[PDB]
Design a protein around this nucleic acid. Sequence first.
RNA 1: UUGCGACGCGAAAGCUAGCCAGAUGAUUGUCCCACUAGCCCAACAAGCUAGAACGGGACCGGUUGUUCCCCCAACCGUAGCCUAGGGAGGCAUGCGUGACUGGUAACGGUCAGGUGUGAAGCCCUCCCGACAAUGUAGCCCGAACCGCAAGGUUGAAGCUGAAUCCGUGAGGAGGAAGCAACUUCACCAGUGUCAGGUGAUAGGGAACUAGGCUUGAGGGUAUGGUGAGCACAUGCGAAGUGAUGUCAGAAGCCUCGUCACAGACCAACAGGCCAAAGACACUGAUAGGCCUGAGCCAAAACGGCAAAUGGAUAGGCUACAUCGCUCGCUCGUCGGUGUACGGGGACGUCAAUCCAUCGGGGCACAGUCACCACCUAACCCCUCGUGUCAUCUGGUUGGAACGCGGUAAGCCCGUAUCCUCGCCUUGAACACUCAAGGCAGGCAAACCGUAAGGAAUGCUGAUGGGGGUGCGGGUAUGGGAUGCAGGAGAAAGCGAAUGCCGGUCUGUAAUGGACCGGAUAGGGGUUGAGGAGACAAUCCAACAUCACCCCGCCCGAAAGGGAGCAGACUUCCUGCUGGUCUCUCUUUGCGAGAUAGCCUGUAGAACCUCUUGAAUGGAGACAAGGCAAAUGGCAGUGGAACAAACCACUGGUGCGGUCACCAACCAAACGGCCGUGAGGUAAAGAGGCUGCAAGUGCGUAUCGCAAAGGCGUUCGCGCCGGUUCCUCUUGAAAGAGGGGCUUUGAGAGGCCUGAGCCGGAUGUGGGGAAACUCACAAGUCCGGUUCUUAGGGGGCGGGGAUGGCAGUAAUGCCUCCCUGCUACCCGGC
DNA 2: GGGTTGGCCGAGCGGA
Length: 414
Amino acid sequence: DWAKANREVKRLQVRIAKAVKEGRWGKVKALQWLLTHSFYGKALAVKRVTDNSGSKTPGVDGITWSTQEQKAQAIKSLRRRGYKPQPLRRVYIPKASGKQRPLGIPTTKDRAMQALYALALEPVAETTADRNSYGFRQGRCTADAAGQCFTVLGRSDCAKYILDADITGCFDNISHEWLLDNIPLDKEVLRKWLKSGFVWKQQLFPGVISPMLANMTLDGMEELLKKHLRKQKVNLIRYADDFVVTGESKETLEKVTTVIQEFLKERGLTLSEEKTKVVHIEEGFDFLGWNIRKYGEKLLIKPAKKNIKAFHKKIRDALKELRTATQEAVIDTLNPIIKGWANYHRNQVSKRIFNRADDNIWHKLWRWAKRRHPNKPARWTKNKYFIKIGNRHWVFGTWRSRYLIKAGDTRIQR
RNA sequence: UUGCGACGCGAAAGCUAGCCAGAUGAUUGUCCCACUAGCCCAACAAGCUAGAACGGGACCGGUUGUUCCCCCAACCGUAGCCUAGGGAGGCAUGCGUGACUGGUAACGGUCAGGUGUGAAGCCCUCCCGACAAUGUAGCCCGAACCGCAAGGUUGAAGCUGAAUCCGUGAGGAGGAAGCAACUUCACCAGUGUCAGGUGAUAGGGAACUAGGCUUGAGGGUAUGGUGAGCACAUGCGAAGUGAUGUCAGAAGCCUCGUCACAGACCAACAGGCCAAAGACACUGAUAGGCCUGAGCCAAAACGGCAAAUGGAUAGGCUACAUCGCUCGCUCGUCGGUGUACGGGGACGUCAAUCCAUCGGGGCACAGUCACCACCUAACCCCUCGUGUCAUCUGGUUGGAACGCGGUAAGCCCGUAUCCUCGCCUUGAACACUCAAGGCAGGCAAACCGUAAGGAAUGCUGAUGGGGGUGCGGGUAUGGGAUGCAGGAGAAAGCGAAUGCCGGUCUGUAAUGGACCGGAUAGGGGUUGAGGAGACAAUCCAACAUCACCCCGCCCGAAAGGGAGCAGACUUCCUGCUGGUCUCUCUUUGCGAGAUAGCCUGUAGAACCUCUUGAAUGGAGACAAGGCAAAUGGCAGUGGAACAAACCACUGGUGCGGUCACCAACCAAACGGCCGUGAGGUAAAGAGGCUGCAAGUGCGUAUCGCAAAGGCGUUCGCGCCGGUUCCUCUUGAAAGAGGGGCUUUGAGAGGCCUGAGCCGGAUGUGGGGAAACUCACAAGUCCGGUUCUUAGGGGGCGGGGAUGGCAGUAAUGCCUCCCUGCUACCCGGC
DNA sequence: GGGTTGGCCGAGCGGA
Ligand SMILES: [Mg+2]
Ligand SMILES: [Mg+2]
Ligand SMILES: [Mg+2]
Ligand SMILES: [Mg+2]
Ligand SMILES: [Mg+2]
Ligand SMILES: [Mg+2]
Ligand SMILES: [Mg+2]
Ligand SMILES: [Mg+2]
Ligand SMILES: [Mg+2]
Ligand SMILES: [Mg+2]
Ligand SMILES: [Mg+2]
Ligand SMILES: [Mg+2]
Ligand SMILES: [Mg+2]
Ligand SMILES: [Mg+2]
Ligand SMILES: [Mg+2]
Ligand SMILES: [Mg+2]
Ligand SMILES: [Mg+2]
Ligand SMILES: [Mg+2]
Ligand SMILES: [Mg+2]
Ligand SMILES: [Mg+2]
Ligand SMILES: [Mg+2]
Ligand SMILES: [Mg+2]
Ligand SMILES: [Mg+2]
Ligand SMILES: [Mg+2]
Ligand SMILES: [Mg+2]
Ligand SMILES: [Mg+2]
Ligand SMILES: [Mg+2]
Ligand SMILES: [Mg+2]
Ligand SMILES: [Mg+2]
Ligand SMILES: [Mg+2]
Ligand SMILES: [Mg+2]
Ligand SMILES: [Mg+2]
Ligand code: NA
């Protein structure tokens, strides 16, 4: 099946996008209508449901037996006409960073319809979106937001004034009428969705279809900031909801404040007064964990000290849990944490920050090894827990050698 | 489950505490006199010894008084003893292992030799003994060239040290002879050589570690301690007061300075220098090398200035306190602080050395800070006194984990005695009949299991098994954690108590203490303990908690076993019990909250059927920000040369809108209007049936959480919390604000293990001068307390599952569950 | 503005 079921869907996605590169929204709505009423679209929809850890919804359906795939997909073969979405189930997943962050879970049939119209929406939200919008799109990392911050703010390639903005309104605070007016999908399905209390009201508009909506609602910013015409003055860089704007002066960024607040005025959104601030590089703004400053005609994207303190909080808590552990288990928990904070900051100025990070986790590991055996000397723990692994002594681990990854040895790529 | 630890006793023996009294040694540099000793052997004295004998004078050495010098002052002394520490024996004991032996068995006794332990409650003698082990973060060494390996030559931090010389002497000056680790790297302004130097390191060394007592008593005095442990919203508790803090973390500490680890380093880059920078050559004039810097001056190149903001200082094997990035307590070296530390002189002081306030990181076995009450007196001050310290001896009161004692109910074994006793299948004969065999059961264990124990095999299989009782032999063994009550048995104690039971007074939070009263044992005979008696002649006496025989009574049939109050400790049996936690359902709070159905309108061009009627059926091009009830698992073109597989490219599927059709049906023009064809043909309405829209179902099925109250009360409420939901904020388990509530039951099921702490009575050791602290199973014992829900594995007995193997079958056997026991092992304290 | 390696004082009694 799936050796062609992805293929026909993706070809028809290509045809939707080729429709939107000319006007032809009749062609677009025809191919959306057709792809939604395709067997392959429905089969893909139930695969995307079954591969996201389905659990108890209100309208409980199963996942298993490899026939309820065919049962449910023939069920939504009919189901466009009498489709009534049932409301959500208020499910708390206990995040390991502070709460049980709530996440309203739809019905499996409702999330299958969401996956259907998600593969309908995607090739329109590719082409009609921005070109400096990096949130939640295809093929785009948050590192590319830093790359756009680089080739915007480089060797005097801006003029030193940047607006650090952010958008209020927690939920999909968008006026429902605006969504129903201009979104390239069938207004009856979206009409039934927005009535239903669509996503549970602790949602932060960054459940598959809601990023497609929250990208489509924020795609006029780049065009309406080509109302200003200078050389490299206005550049907008936006990751999913958190954007910063460039400029050349304090009052022209206030033109940009009034412009963007008129833009979001039509929708249900307002920029804040707190989180919005104008700032002069070099005084720095925080953007996706990376501090951007200048430090005297350098650029120096550095990972900010609120993305370092969060990483030390993660390792501090990983060892406050493993307080009586085995040494190889301590390597096993602490090693992908450091590798994930390595591959994420490996394109920026981070090597100095990596040596300070390995320093601080080393002191945590030393306090680990010394709190292990209280009344026992120090040369014992140094040669029992730490290995001369090379030129380096003090390399934590045991055993072919099992040992932590020094984040400082992770080879920053230009 | 920790080497032992329970309980009574100290009859006796040996450790041990308090007190009393004696004896002995000692009371710690040298000399001179003072006093006394062997002192006139002439009481003169010149001369001999010892001196807490507690005197004075003059001197030696050491340490402190901040490096060196010269004074001065205080303190210490080469003596005796004790301990830590080391060595060597015996001795005792724990666990094994073989050899022998008792006994019917259960179970023992004895030697050997293998390994432990001998102690903070628990071995004896001897020797070395304040010298040493032992340790170390700072300091010092850790070379210098001959050269075959490093062999030697020398050096060498340093150790030890004679000869000599001075002084009455303590001592002072020299250091011959001897001993001694020295191993491996890196940097020097390119490379190589040679010279001249610096920094890690194996080890070595210095330094300390390396003790204590030898003058007491009172009074004042704290820099020295204590005032529980826990939780915290409230508190429990006999056990200060009040703040403040709990993981987005107080106090303390390690770092570091706004880009906030090594006041880092190397590379890059930028600015400057230099002529290969100690020489001798090679190479390079510019990247050739070096300096400085994510700040600045520099420049022959000596290096300096500020380093977030202020601020301080000279010289420490000094003493005390703290700290060196977090368990408590005692220590060793080294380093930083803070307080205290005579007179003069010389040398000369400051380096990013240190402190303080902010600020960035961190570190977390939860305390901290202030006050109050009380304790102790080292030091100092004051008063009084002449001793003090160690050991041994004797007395006396005590104690114990050391020494002694107790078999009895439990269990095992033997003995006599009463009761019970199979099961199958076949040949069954006279019908119970009986056989033959296997089972079930009784005994050995080869072998396995560290271990609980099990099992091959063999042995027996009513000639034998099992249960009950009465005896006899053996062995029961030692932990506070949930009490209590009853029974079996009950050591020591008492023929009148140390116990018991009443009574009186009194103390603690609780255990307690003193005193008065009361009960409490069949007989005889015997040995004849032991005292009597002028005596050994009397030659006794019955109790010596009763040594041994018969009757009174019980029990048993017998042998006999028993029988007065308490009756400790360990056991065994029976009953009633406690606490807390996990899971499931229930009920209530907060939030969410539907589909099917029922109903009222709406739409159906893209859903059907039917009735209809200018009112039908099948198909093309063009478009398409209008819509939809099968749909793109569709079709076409091309690549394969069209062909077989696969791959590129195109497609709006339908309704609607416009041109444009094909089938099927005709208004008008037309000879009495019989006939004709050029020409015209797109609705409405009823049934279901799907959707929509509201309502009812319904605050319901169901889902996510949660069940926590206290205090003031002025009775209205308020504050502190808890719980659910919403909103702001934060990277974040933090916070801010708001709404509600402030709240029930049952079910089975775990589990009894530990941490301590306080008081009292006793012991021991480290620290301390002492209070007091840290430990000895919470020291132990009793008493009072909170807290932890209290760990895995394995085995044996019973009832089932009970699928198979073996099976004529009895049934066992590998596999599951329920249930009883188990210290049987590895934790753990 | 990338590239390397540091950190370790010992004894003893008793515990979370
Ligand atoms: Mg005695
Ligand atoms: Mg004497
Ligand atoms: Mg002197
Ligand atoms: Mg002086
Ligand atoms: Mg010996
Ligand atoms: Mg001495
Ligand atoms: Mg050296
Ligand atoms: Mg050498
Ligand atoms: Mg050394
Ligand atoms: Mg000495
Ligand atoms: Mg005081
Ligand atoms: Mg500083
Ligand atoms: Mg800086
Ligand atoms: Mg500097
Ligand atoms: Mg000194
Ligand atoms: Mg006093
Ligand atoms: Mg006693
Ligand atoms: Mg005892
Ligand atoms: Mg006991
Ligand atoms: Mg025991
Ligand atoms: Mg008790
Ligand atoms: Mg009893
Ligand atoms: Mg007795
Ligand atoms: Mg009496
Ligand atoms: Mg009484
Ligand atoms: Mg009761
Ligand atoms: Mg009940
Ligand atoms: Mg005591
Ligand atoms: Mg002990
Ligand atoms: Mg006690
Ligand atoms: Mg313990
Ligand atoms: Mg203990
Ligand atoms: Na426990």
